[PDB]
Amino acid sequence: MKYILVTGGVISGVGKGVIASSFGTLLKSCGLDVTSIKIDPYINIDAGTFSPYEHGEVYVLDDGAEVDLDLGNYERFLDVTLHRDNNITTGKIYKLVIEKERTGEYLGKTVQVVPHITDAIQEWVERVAQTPVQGSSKPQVCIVELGGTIGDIEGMPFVEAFRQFQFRVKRENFCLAHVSLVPLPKATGEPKTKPTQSSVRELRGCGLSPDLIVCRSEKPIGLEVKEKISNFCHVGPDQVICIHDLNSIYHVPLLMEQNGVIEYLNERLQLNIDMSKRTKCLQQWRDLARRTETVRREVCIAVVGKYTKFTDSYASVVKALQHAALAVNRKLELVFIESCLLEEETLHSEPSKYHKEWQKLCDSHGILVPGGFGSRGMEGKIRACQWARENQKPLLGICLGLQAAVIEFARNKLGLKDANTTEIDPNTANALVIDMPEHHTGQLGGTMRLGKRITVFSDGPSVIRQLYGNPKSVQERHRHRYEVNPKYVHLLEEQGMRFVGTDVDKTRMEIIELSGHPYFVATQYHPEYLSRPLKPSPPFLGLILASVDRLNQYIQ
Amino acid sequence: MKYILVTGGVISGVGKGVIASSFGTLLKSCGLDVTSIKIDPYINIDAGTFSPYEHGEVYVLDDGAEVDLDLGNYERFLDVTLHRDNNITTGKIYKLVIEKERTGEYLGKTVQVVPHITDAIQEWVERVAQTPVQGSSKPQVCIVELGGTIGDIEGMPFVEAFRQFQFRVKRENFCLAHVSLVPLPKATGEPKTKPTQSSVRELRGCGLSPDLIVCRSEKPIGLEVKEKISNFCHVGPDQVICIHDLNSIYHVPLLMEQNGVIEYLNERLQLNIDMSKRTKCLQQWRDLARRTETVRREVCIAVVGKYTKFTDSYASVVKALQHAALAVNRKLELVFIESCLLEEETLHSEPSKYHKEWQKLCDSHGILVPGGFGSRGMEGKIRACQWARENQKPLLGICLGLQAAVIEFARNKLGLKDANTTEIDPNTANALVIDMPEHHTGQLGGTMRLGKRITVFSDGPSVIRQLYGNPKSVQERHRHRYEVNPKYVHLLEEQGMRFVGTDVDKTRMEIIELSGHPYFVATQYHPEYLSRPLKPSPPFLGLILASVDRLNQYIQ
Amino acid sequence: MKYILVTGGVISGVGKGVIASSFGTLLKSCGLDVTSIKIDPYINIDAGTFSPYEHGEVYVLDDGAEVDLDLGNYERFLDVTLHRDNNITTGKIYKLVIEKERTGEYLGKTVQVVPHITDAIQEWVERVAQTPVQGSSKPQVCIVELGGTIGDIEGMPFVEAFRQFQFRVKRENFCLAHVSLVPLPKATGEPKTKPTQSSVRELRGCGLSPDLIVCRSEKPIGLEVKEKISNFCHVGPDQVICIHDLNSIYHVPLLMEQNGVIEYLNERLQLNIDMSKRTKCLQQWRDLARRTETVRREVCIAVVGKYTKFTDSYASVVKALQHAALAVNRKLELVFIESCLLEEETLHSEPSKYHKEWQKLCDSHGILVPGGFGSRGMEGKIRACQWARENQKPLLGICLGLQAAVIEFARNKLGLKDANTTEIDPNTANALVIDMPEHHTGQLGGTMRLGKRITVFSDGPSVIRQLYGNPKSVQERHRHRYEVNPKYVHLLEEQGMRFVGTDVDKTRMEIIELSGHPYFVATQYHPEYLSRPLKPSPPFLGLILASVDRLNQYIQ
Ligand SMILES: Nc1ccn([C@@H]2O[C@H](COP(=O)(O)OP(=O)(O)OP(=O)(O)O)[C@@H](O)[C@H]2O)c(=O)n1
Ligand SMILES: Nc1ccn([C@@H]2O[C@H](COP(=O)(O)OP(=O)(O)OP(=O)(O)O)[C@@H](O)[C@H]2O)c(=O)n1
Ligand SMILES: Nc1ccn([C@@H]2O[C@H](COP(=O)(O)OP(=O)(O)OP(=O)(O)O)[C@@H](O)[C@H]2O)c(=O)n1
Ligand SMILES: Nc1ccn([C@@H]2O[C@H](COP(=O)(O)OP(=O)(O)OP(=O)(O)O)[C@@H](O)[C@H]2O)c(=O)n1
Ligand SMILES: Nc1ccn([C@@H]2O[C@H](COP(=O)(O)OP(=O)(O)OP(=O)(O)O)[C@@H](O)[C@H]2O)c(=O)n1
Ligand SMILES: Nc1ccn([C@@H]2O[C@H](COP(=O)(O)OP(=O)(O)OP(=O)(O)O)[C@@H](O)[C@H]2O)c(=O)n1
Ligand SMILES: [Mg+2]
Ligand SMILES: [Mg+2]
Ligand SMILES: [Mg+2]
Ligand SMILES: [Mg+2]
Ligand SMILES: [Mg+2]
Ligand SMILES: [Mg+2]
């Protein structure tokens, strides 16, 4: 088992995740099995506490784990399926060790950070690196990405663990890549290597020695800066890799392959890649990165979102839209519309922003209501679903656009003008959405539907069955708690709201599709968790093909 | 509230505990209320897992907590009663924070070491420093002793916490004392200040600045070494305190008062001691420290102990014996006798060590069987209790010498030759000791008798009632699980084994005293937890007064 | 004597010189006597070895010292006269100590870096801080600017010296200001305080504690960044000073006075400024900084310079031009014309750049030939002087434009077509410029005319006498070696080349002024060494007033 550790230098927002993912993509293209581990030095255990407006985009693995979005980035770039243990945190390690000590399996000894916490870290890393992530074959390389910057208090147990680890796994199996900031004060316009010198000094002091240096700057750095860095950091000048700000993120593995990273890793980790097939063709990645700078025709999509700030709060959604638009060969223009600026309460307060938001929503080609874990701004979501329903505008709803869609449908098409949720307003005669928790053996009470579940379609006349390649079932990822009530599902089925897919027991409803409309569908699950750069997801594919009037042509 | 933080320098075994305790003793003598906090950077939560041969001498507070022996040292030197929270560890802090995060009282934020763990440490320290330890009056100074050496990974959260803390409590209320090693290579016989320079550099880097430097050497250091240290560490030359190896530990507060520490603390922390009464007489401490170097007549006591190694494995016991001997005005010579080297199995293996151990046990004036948390070597304890019973040699048993004494009494005086425990050999018709756990409301099951409990004596003719000042009750500290069976307690009461004291409900037995013997008593509790330098404990007092034939004279 | 030390943080080009000069300007305006010391950690002793294309603009003090240009910046901003010892370097200190040791005035002891080099540094600093720089009154504050970044090997003796020094001069007389880089990666657009945290940690470790933090960013930083910095660096949030990129350098003292630096220094150094007169009016500095952003009408000046690169290679010249243009109330547009691109050798090689350079020289309003210490490109200087002479374009020559002007005058007006220098081509019958070195008692041989010398004018009809306020003499600064030959000075005086000023002995010639021309003058000295922001120098004043046809109007 070979390891590649990716550490960070001067500051935090220095670009470690894209470097690690690109390493993975290169090695994958060369024919290797690659897993990856992300280490977060914060005290949390999961993302089930994280507020959406505070961190954004809980990513859900197919075993039901709510983890960092960085594991989502690895899943997209490497095309693998990671588990909950592929994400180590400080809280997880300290909890495992404190519990082990409290049930007396250290045999009365004093448990200390060194060596017990570092032994725990090393055993965890060695353990989850042999777990298969692509089928059943063992991985051959593991990319470990360490969060934070060297010198911080929070990351010291981990660098101590990895010093000992580099000697435990026989250094010919261990490579370290250091990502640092080469700043450039515009008072003189010269790249400064002094912060990199300091950070590599701290790294050497802690016991680790870099094999690659990845510099982060805005344009390329010359050979003099490269030679100064290789002199102070003890690498070769070819092992100093410059990654400037490129067009897209899909150009970073190509820029890494242009700097000859594959040959250095093939000799340093003693892999035995046969460097003959075009040097392990990254051919379709080249096609995709070329399309990213070629598309011209625009498609405008609206995103009715509560936390309009985009500190990665709709990351998987935006990326599913991008992967869909690139395969449709069109440029994506994304509009973010606050959902609370759509209710006429703002009209009562000040009509200016109300009107401009409504005009931005009106001049769009398609609508996407994402799933906010909450009820704040749901009124705007109902208004937007209604507007799109009575204007023949294509719409896709995600885990809450289903609830909002069925609510507005009942309200303004079946006369149940008091239909609402039990999310809020739990005092309602017409509870259109109810709470049907999961009851699996091993539960006392009930919890969400979490993870990969099977879904079976109903009948013939539906487009979602076509976009999915006409299969009988489809496995997707669920993170919901509330459903719709079957009384009403057969009430509002005579009126135009067909239910196309649901579980094997037919007790819940997952995909609605109101007929007599170009594209009006909704899903309880999240389709943006299985969207990859080289294979988009069929719901977003259809939403893009409909918003530019290419859907029917694509069906045939 | 004023604080004094005591940190450590070059190595670990540098003498921090005695420095902190002596600070406390000085300030106490000057008329102040002093509490103290001990910080252990290890991952454990309590000492209930610690093996006795691994750390030695679990100390039991009077609320039932099993803590470090350093809290025992503070209790002896300061004459206070500390609680479980006066002993912070890394495990306690990380467990409190992980639990707070897992029940969502950080409100969805990311919990990080800085600032959340350091905020937790600061709030804990501020909290337990206002808890009264002497009656009900609030403390005025708090001595915080930080374990480990500056620069270690385990102690970084704590020094970060205390940097922020020094600014939160208004520096005129915060003083730091740094204890360092001044080594002396005998190749040249000159004290070296260079390691102190390095450690104070690391301390300054982490954000703290010393107010006192306490050097640790074998003989005094001159004024040139003192001036070099004050030059590199930014203190005055009078704030460099030399503590060499003295006669006893009772000379350290006197040596601190000779270096004018009280005046510096009175001006630096702005206490308002009225330095007139002999400068706050340490008079009876002077008497005790003088007696330590004056006593001449010897008394030899045997300690039948399993783990003959004395890495502080019988600390409170040995110190109770010392406090008893000093008030009796005699020198104490302590013999450690392995309990497993008394059973004739070693006689079968090799009789040499068997015979020499038995001769050491035979030429002693008194026997003390301590309480080992286990059953290893109990056979030797039975043999020793029997030998002392049939030779009129004074004996005191502690929490297991009671069980061993009653076992040998039954065996070799009432014919129940198969009497044993349920500790080991749970298959016995004659279970002399049984398991009567505590059942207090708030329990599901049963746990030990732990902490301070009341004890009432039975009748008139007993010496233990006399040594205790003839009170009706006495509060002591229990850490036992097994008792004796009442059937047998009234069986072997006609034969000479009187039961003098027990609980209020008379369902257990605590003090046995077999009459027709100079001094043969036993106790279920531990009397060595309430033994102080200036007031010994009556059981050990009587054991010393009997082993030198001064008991009857002392009674009158 | 009060001290202010200015140190540097993360990188080198962080802006220390302007911060130190602005401190000086503020304190000067408040009515204090201020001196300043610059510490360069390089091994050189003077700038007499520095190549002009390598460092640029040797500045000449009025005692004959060739020093850094930073002393020129202090002289301009503070309006003082510094000496050679106001510029400490590593070479100076180590040479003084090595020589002291080699002549046995350490009395046989071992001389070590600590304490002997640091004692030398401290005595030097204490010594030159009491030397008067403005008349004869003792200074009251001293600004010490330490070059380089904390953590470098070259600057460790100096920070050790200043730790000891802060305690030697009684901390109430010592203040430290730390200038650091707050970088801003545009991937997220958030200012990062982590490098400042690291550098202040190193600074604290070395023994110094900041009193002010001066952050360097492109736009202002908020109160959250300010609070994070004050938390980690132990200052108040008002002592965190943000200096963004402003219009000019004359806005930095005003931005410092807006952040209340004067009040903090008045309380911290216990100066006794009476903060009543507008809080010590920086009134004419306000006028000048306002004019910097108000001037509209343009004036274009050409600079025929060898090393067209401007790494501060014509700093004093460009600044004299700016100070002149601002008082004339016009905007200055400066053109840099390579002197070697004017000889027709480039015409033979490629005429494109030749022609474009000649067109840039042709479309200018005035010409300035600066003094290059050499002979490279002098041919272009002769061509430019000739072009300006036969086109009635105003010209000013500086220490080599005098030689070039007299050479072209002889050549193309008196028929001596082989007139040249002994600088190059030492084989010439018509040596128009000769070498007349200085012979002062205390010399074996000859050296340059270096430092402040007196100059007496000749007669009535001249404009340079008018621009100087019609004085009899003027003290200027000389750094030349070659002069003109008196035979020829009376040869080409009938032809239109009048000599207006020279020494007291009339053996050399300093100011030529060819009549029958708007403004054609030349000077052997450098007038750009006495040019101040609030009083320009008369030669450049006249050159600007002539290039915009305002000279004659200004004369009356
Ligand atoms: N394979 C990846 C990796 C990165 N990202 C996105 O690109 C942005 C920048 O990535 P990253 O390198 O992780 O930036 P930072 O997290 O700010 O830098 P660091 O990890 O060093 O803290 C992130 O929002 C991430 O969602 C992505 O699209 N796909
Ligand atoms: N470990 C080091 C490295 C360099 N220097 C000093 O730093 C100075 C160079 O300044 P700087 O430009 O900041 O260093 P660079 O190596 O050039 O780094 P940068 O890329 O930021 O320019 C030199 O005088 C050198 O003596 C030092 O003292 N200690
Ligand atoms: N008030 C005190 C403090 C110390 N001791 C005893 O003296 C010995 C040495 O004390 P200490 O200073 O704590 O030594 P170390 O623990 O080895 O040093 P450190 O705390 O720095 O690790 C210990 O066994 C302790 O039991 C004591 O009798 N009474
Ligand atoms: N921060 C310091 C302190 C001292 N020195 C050097 O260390 C040498 C002194 O050696 P040493 O005896 O080890 O230092 P001392 O201060 O005397 O420490 P010690 O008490 O161990 O003798 C001197 O040459 C001095 O230049 C140094 O380089 N850096
Ligand atoms: N009072 C001053 C100070 C600075 N300068 C000029 O402004 C430029 C930047 O000044 P400085 O702060 O010294 O920049 P650096 O030298 O690059 O930064 P540092 O001193 O920290 O190395 C320099 O070219 C200098 O000539 C100026 O005009 N007048
Ligand atoms: N001395 C310190 C300071 C901070 N942290 C950790 O650093 C993380 C914060 O990351 P970063 O953003 O890089 O630190 P900031 O203080 O916010 O610095 P910056 O201004 O660059 O954002 C937190 O988890 C905190 O636990 C640490 O380990 N050691
Ligand atoms: Mg990242
Ligand atoms: Mg440099
Ligand atoms: Mg100790
Ligand atoms: Mg020495
Ligand atoms: Mg500078
Ligand atoms: Mg941050």
Residue numbers in the entry:
A (entry chain A), B (entry chain C), C (entry chain B): 1 to 556
What text comes from the article?
For the product-bound state (dmCTPS+Pro), we imaged dmCTPS in the presence of 10 mM Mg2+ and 2 mM CTP and picked 1,563,553 particles. In contrast, the dmCTPS+Pro model represents an inhibited state of dmCTPS. In this conformation, the UTP binding site is occupied by CTP as a well-known competitive inhibitor. To our surprise, we identified a second CTP molecule in an individual subunit of the dmCTPS+Pro tetramer, whose binding site overlaps with ATP/ADP. Since CTP is the only nucleotide present under the conditions of analysis, it is unlikely that another molecule could be mistaken for CTP in our map. In addition, the electron density agrees very well with the CTP structure, confirming our findings of the CTP binding site of CTPS and also raising the possibility that binding competition, which inhibits the activity of CTPS, may occur at both the UTP and ATP binding sites. However, the unexpected finding of a CTP molecule siting at the ATP/ADP binding site of the map gives rise to the notion that CTP may block CTPS by competing with UTP and also with ATP, suggesting an added level of complexity of feedback inhibition. The wing is also flexible in our dmCTPS+Pro model. In the dmCTPS+Pro tetramer, the length is around 23.5 Å, and the diameter ranges from 3.38 to 5.54 Å. We analyzed the conformational change at the UTP binding site and determined that the distance from CTP to the exit of the tunnel is about 18.8 Å in the dmCTPS+Pro, whereas UTP in dmCTPS+Sub sits right before the opening at a distance of about 5.4 Å.
Cytidine triphosphate synthase (CTPS) catalyzes the final and rate-limiting step of de novo CTP biosynthesis, in which a UTP is converted into CTP with the consumption of an ATP and a glutamine. A CTPS protein comprises two domains, the N-terminal ammonia ligase (AL) domain and the C-terminal glutamine amidotransferase (GAT) domain. While the active site at the AL domain activates UTP by phosphorylation using ATP to generate an iminophosphate intermediate that can react with ammonia to yield CTP, the GAT domain mediates the hydrolysis of glutamine to yield NH3 with GTP as allosteric activator. The nascent ammonia is delivered through an “ammonia tunnel,” which connects the active sites at both domains, to complete the reaction.
